[PDB]
Ligand binder design. Structure first.
Ligand SMILES: *[C@@H]1O[C@H](CO)[C@@H](O[C@@H]2O[C@H](CO)[C@@H](O[C@@H]3O[C@H](CO)[C@@H](O)[C@H](O)[C@@H]3O)[C@H](O)[C@H]2NC(C)=O)[C@H](O)[C@H]1NC(C)=O
Lengths: 84, 50
């Protein structure tokens, strides 16, 4: 399958005090229809993080993806009504 | 035997147990949870935690 249109999160496990830059990375498999592991990048950006009563993430919008991105970025909301 | 504290720029979390004592309930006090302080009404609290 594909990376679905949906929601996710993560969780910290281990503090690794590396102290040095990292150049490359490589995976480990053992073999020998569409399944694949997708790798892009992470960028020095800023997002929006909406949270619930339980204390869990629900929605998210960038700051610099589009005009709507900075619109939610500064207006400090997810509804965000019309205007300039 | 030699004990060397290697305090490089690397984070400081390998530490010592300072004063872990009986929890002060319902007495207006500050606190020292590893670096954070504040005058707290420290008692059992009614919320879910993760
Ligand atoms: C958010 O916090 C609430 C607070 O407890 C969590 O609620 C718990 O949710 C589970 C299922 O999500 C409930 O289990 C259900 O119990 C009922 C009977 O109470 C049963 O009929 C169902 O079949 C199911 O087993 C659990 O009861 C409920 N807690 C309480 C005290 O009722 C919720 O899981 C938390 N959600 C997240 C995402 O952290």
């Amino acid at each position: 399958r594909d990376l679905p249109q949906g929601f996710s999160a993560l969780e910290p496990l281990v503090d690794l005090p590396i102290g040095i830059n990292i150049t490359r990375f490589q995976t480990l498999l053992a073999l020998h229809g569409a399944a694949a592991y997708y790798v892009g990048y992470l960028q020095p950006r800023t997002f929006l993080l909406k949270y619930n009563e339980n204390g869990t993430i629900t929605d998210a919008v960038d700051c610099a993806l589009d005009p709507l991105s900075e619109t939610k970025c500064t207006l400090k909301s997810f509804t965000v009504e019309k205007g300039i | 035997v030699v004990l060397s504290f290697e305090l490089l720029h690397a984070p400081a979390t390998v530490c010592g147990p300072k004063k872990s004592t009986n929890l002060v309930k319902n007495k207006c006090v500050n606190f020292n949870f590893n670096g954070l302080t504040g005058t707290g009404v420290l008692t059992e609290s009614n919320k879910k935690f993760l």
